């Protein structure tokens, strides 16, 4: 029963209505219980909820779950031993059917049926030999399935049940064959026309097996005998089937006087099973599994349901009819149902039944199956949803026929007449149906019947049969109240049509006076009839206001107005019309005047003071839309805004008197009378109640307020009648309904505190001075009443100290109010995202006037609520702690105040709902309140410390002296909290405090990630008061605590803060050293202005943010040095410091040694009373003889000059001589004094420089090699810190690099880890340009070392990767374009620039290392493979090196690594590196050249003389870097460059395309015999790996996931199967290679598992066949493995793309020659060979239809391939091949298919398909789809898978290696050195000269 808290509260109150009902059924022995159950039968009331019946269901479920065990029918899904076939005892059936027969009568007359939970005993009961039990259990299952299909528990997936249902449906067949008849349909059973076929009359059952019990063996054995005999033979897995079949045979065995009864039961069960199957199963699944086996279902169903037949069983009629009500729920079956019934003709069966229904109703001969009629109407109303069927029934005479029923007079069968009237309402939607109803005098009989019913009902009060077991407001039989409700609800739907006519028909009728009889008798007709009666009155006035006088004469409106309060009751639909009923009465000015008088607006709000009425309205959408309608009633009639307000206020002013102390929320435990635990080892009194207590929505107030604040939230939208409430309502009166005096613990979570924060946020933007100062006074006064909780001992829990008293109850109640107040405050008024200027001024005024008493209390609240969540967790068993963890609260996302100290990994999942108790609820209520009292108390302090600095406003002197005065009081309180407790025993508290300090003192990250910037001025005051001297004494105390821990290694692998002293002692040491590194980085610090802003009596005006760092570093560095003194670090090899604590101590040094351009000598204390116009002086002047504002000017002009020794121009003699007596001899006080030294002797920049020197000269950088080997996890930090140190103390870093290298050249290789770290550091240093230029000698020596030391056998050591990393750093630079120098005075002026030099490795060294790296062996290290790939991508730039790489076999060894580490996350990088290296192994000078040319010319177009060269070489950097020589060469044969400059130097670098310039000299080439030659062998390896990965399970889901099995991953993750990821990678690689490079195809074409040599290798087809047949040959298919289907489709798309890419033509220089349609014989040869296989594949798949059944899924793809081929479009493709070139692809591929003869090879496949095979539908459909495309294309001519084109991969390489697009600029001299003398000079001088020479 997963309900919302509101729905649960509504239903728990609704269930209180059926207390007499439950008590009447649950207070009986048991024989009586069944006796009462068997007397319910017919409902005389509305459809009850199932929730209120649940207790009866449980008493019944238990009774069944005990009789199930009696016969062992109880099954255990997992054990297929099956329950032994044992016929249930006769008497014991009645006991089991009196209950299962009532579960139908209950589940039909009940809604919210989804709460049913007994669908487990049903499975256990289904495995029962007896069918009657099975009949009932299947009827109930069918009803439950109907409910489910209508709704769009878990048992709808249980495959065992699915099979039981499928077999019971495929029970005795509907009709098969008889020698003297067509098929003996089931209906024939009851006609003595055909005799039952003898096949049914005997038994023959299989499981290899065959058991037969021919008749005369089924006629003597009793059912139990047969059931046992068979099971003895057959396995238990097939006992159910034997039971069903033997029962069928024995039932048909003889035409006895009883056997027929059992046949009836079996057929009924079959029908109900069909219905259930139709519900759970999918339509295609239902057709394939159920109808395929039995296609005669419908043809039989539509024969049984015929009331005219008096021989068919009355129960079979309903069951067959019920099956159709389920089947029709899917529109696909509706058409056939109507066709079978005859719903298209007017004389069919569907209309012959309707006439018999009327015949019976017109005579009442006890042959009226009112359930039959009702369900027939449901069937028709389901068939009527299919618009084609709606029209078919309309034209067949539905309405003319249905109008013969509802026109019956004085009928007593109102169950059928009410359903017919609802069917009529549903049917009539068009104008055709409406005008056909009206035309046949339909609307005149409707209103005549309504009046007749109403008139009779009132006159005959002896026919009233109201319910006696529900709470209702009528006195008439529900039958009559429903018939009238149906007539009225159709009278309403017929009024939205041409109401001008319908309203005139109403007037000339007795309807109007018969409606005043409904209104003048409400206790008779109830409220659902008054809701429909008042809806006509309001819908009749709003469409014809001229009728208002008539409605007044009849006396309706006069009665509506004079009895309005009498007409309101707890009915949701009634209450949603009252605003619309007043908006119609008000259309008449006299009506409006009467509404103003008589208080018809006071009645639209007064009902909200009643819990019963508020609960019905809910408090959600219906409640809000009742407010937005009141506002409309104010708009249309602005004359009522004076009454909607005088009523609203009178409601808000009266609620506080309706509040009562209903419940108590804290309960003492029964045993000890203590609310809370008192030890970690108490005994838990487990209960079965709800773990989370809910009291709000179950209260008379939680509904009243939840509804009222929803009305208010609706009415707040836009200005209206609510906007004027403040002008009439005091703020206090509005805050007496929100801040109740005893709310529950969940009040601040309610919707009354989520709507009233939208009402108060709307009264804020407008009335900014209305509530604020009152909300704050309420806060301050509530916190002032907790003067005994806040001001209590800090060494014990205030609550535990008085457990069992009332103060525990009378204090938690105060904190519950304080929790809603603070949630209001921090959500409405003080929000860092909403702080406006006026809000800030309001805060300043509040603190000026009321005083700083609120902050001294907010500190005490956070301090005591953190001491009570620690003293209480030190007395609670760990299970309780993980149960009562309060974080999972609405809205709140943690991420801030009080840190949660878990006991179990939160990332694991949930842990609540495994234990409960009185105590486990009394502490979940406490720890939840305590959590928001601290969470909201920390957001308040964050805002109290930002204030103006958020808006950056300009402030006055009194508006600054206060801000710096709030900052001074929030910080002296943050310190008082830290200075109070002691770490010993309160560590969990010091961890909350140190996260609170780091939260208040930081601003949110103003970016998606960003970081928490520091609040500089609060931090400055913090230091001023000694806030960092405290963090030192905390850190020198948490460092001896971290040094006496044993297992410091485990701490480095934690991801959840536990309550272990170990981890706690570490967490405080990172939340301190982190706050201490944040106040030292000018990037994490807020850039406040200079000190002069505040003081003027200073010496040096410094930037406060910059000047604060120095004092901080002078202490941090001193503490560090002291630490090194005490044998802790930079010494010892035992790693005395965890990884994270050392990460901070290293960023503490990069900052300690960063220099900020400011030399501070002394820092002045920031004091609010000493800011300029010093108040400490101005206030004193005020004390005697105020020079008001003149004193201000006096100090402003004298520059803060204290009147020296006499009154001069002011200070009258009496004013003086007093200023003398005052002004004590301490003139210092009135000036900003300098800060004192902290920790160190002097915290000035001089001392910072003097300590950094001492640290520097102690050779700690020379002591760095003594630590580095042990902390390899962080060497970049070790580098940045060291580089910063050296930069600060300018020193040649090259010297330190040499020192590192010398260590390497003497480090034994037996130290892999020291060598790894050392090489990583060396590589990191070389990565900086300012040191690279000075390391040529170092890099040469490194190359040497590598050559002499490195051996291929080291590939698996962890230092190999770093050695290759440094080598790559050297290489990338070494392979930059060879810089050329300007020559022969190229001029151009503008001195070029010249770029930095680059170390150039001697060529032999490259070769000697390459010959070492290609020779490596099997790699078991991911990082070795990654580094080798990155290095080899460089050598592959040269074809000669790529040849060696490919022939080496290195690629196989890398693919092995790729395959092995397919689960490792970073496998993507290795995948990409391998892809790039392989792509580079196929690229050749020719292909390169072609693409290089195609790139530059495409740059020259742009399509926005042009193209400044400095852009081409900065946008095509990858293009140049692939082959700079070729780029230069091609660039010189065009782009001959313009703008020679006036003198001819060359001013700018813009180039001219110069198409044809330099002539068109060109060479020729033929290719062939090279691609044919190539046989690189890479494709052999890739295909071998894929063809080997196919065998392994690339479909099976891996073992399991443990946290998101039914979550996250679900099927979302298709790469979990390790082989699939390997397969996916290989397939993507294959697509890219086969679609990019021509040589790749010839390898795919001639692939062969045995790599035998054959010049011009034979074009084998092993690969193509593998892709077509074998690759997707994994049978599986069965079951419903979502993951397997996903993987199959993914591989299908990838394989299809592979073939299309294999058939496409590679993009090349021939871009604009797309016009050419010549083709290529080789490309042709590829396509003929490929298609000719698919043809040859189809002509095998087709013949021998036997074969077709197997190759029926392969044929579904071979046809899709044909579609993609001729529509040149495949999944995941089209990123690679030019769109210009796919004109011949489609065209030529078509032309080929036509020529090949494959518009007809498809047809011959269709001409050989026995259509009986179900898949034929699919095969035929796609086969046409391919033909459609082929013809379509012919006419014109008369997911996480990223694939990228070749050049895009060059870009990838460039991105990985060169981190600068500038580098390509290096060749600029070359082009300048090249064409210019012979290009620019020549062309230009000639061009301008010849044209000039022309004239």
Residue numbers in the entry: 2 to 153, 159 to 213, 236 to 1532, 1539 to 1872, 2220 to 2276
What do the authors of the reporting publication say about this deposited model?
Tom1p is a large, 374 kDa member of a broadly conserved family of HUWE1 factors (also called Mule, Lasu, Ureb1, Arf-BP1, HectH9/E3^Histone^, Ptr1, Upl1, or Eel-1;). This family is characterized by a large N-terminal domain attached to a smaller C-terminal HECT domain (Homologous to E6-AP Carboxyl Terminus) that provides ubiquitin ligase activity ([Fig fig1]). Tom1p has been implicated in the turnover of excess levels of small, basic proteins including ribosomal components and histones. We determined cryo-EM structures of Tom1p to reveal a helical repeat solenoid architecture for the 2,888 residues preceding the C-terminal HECT domain and an overall architecture that resembles the published structures of HUWE1 but with a larger fraction of ordered residues.
We performed single-particle cryo-EM reconstructions of two Tom1p constructs: full-length Tom1p that contained a 20-residue tag including 12 histidines inserted between residues K1074-D1075 (Tom1p^His^; physiologically active in all phenotype assays) and Tom1p^ΔAD^ with the C-terminal Protein A described for intact Tom1p above ([Fig fig2], presumably inactive). These structures were determined at resolutions of 3.97 Å (Tom1p^His^) and 3.07 Å (Tom1p^ΔAD^) for the dominant closed ring conformations ([Fig fig6], 7C, S6). The two maps and structural models were very similar to each other, indicating that neither the internal affinity tag, the absence of the acidic domain, or the presence of a C-terminal Protein A scar induced notable conformational changes. Unless otherwise noted, the higher resolution Tom1p^ΔAD^ map was used for descriptions and illustrations herein. 2,792 (85%) of the 3,268 Tom1p residues were modeled into Tom1p^ΔAD^, which corresponds to 96% of the residues in Tom1p^ΔAD^ ([Fig fig6]). Beginning and end points of missing density in Tom1p^ΔAD^ structure: 214-235, 1873-2219 (region containing acidic domain), 2276-2316, 2399-2449, 2575-2589. The Tom1p acidic domain (residues 1873-2131), which is conserved in HUWE1, is found within a larger disordered region (residues 1871-2219), the ends of which are located on the inner face of the solenoid, suggesting that this unstructured component of Tom1p will at least partially occupy the basket ([Fig fig6], 6C). We therefore deleted the 259-residue acidic domain (Tom1p^ΔAD^; lacking E1873-E2131; 38% D, E, 4% K, R, pI 3.0) and found that the resulting protein no longer bound Spt6p^tSH2^ in the far-western assay ([Fig fig2]). Tom1p^ΔAD^ was expressed at the normal level in yeast and the purified protein was well-behaved ([Fig fig2]), so deletion of the acidic domain did not destabilize Tom1p but did substantially reduce the affinity for Spt6p^tSH2^. Binding was not observed with Tom1p^ΔAD^ but complexes formed normally when just the Spt6p^tSH2^ binding site was removed in Tom1p^Δ11^ ([Fig fig4]).
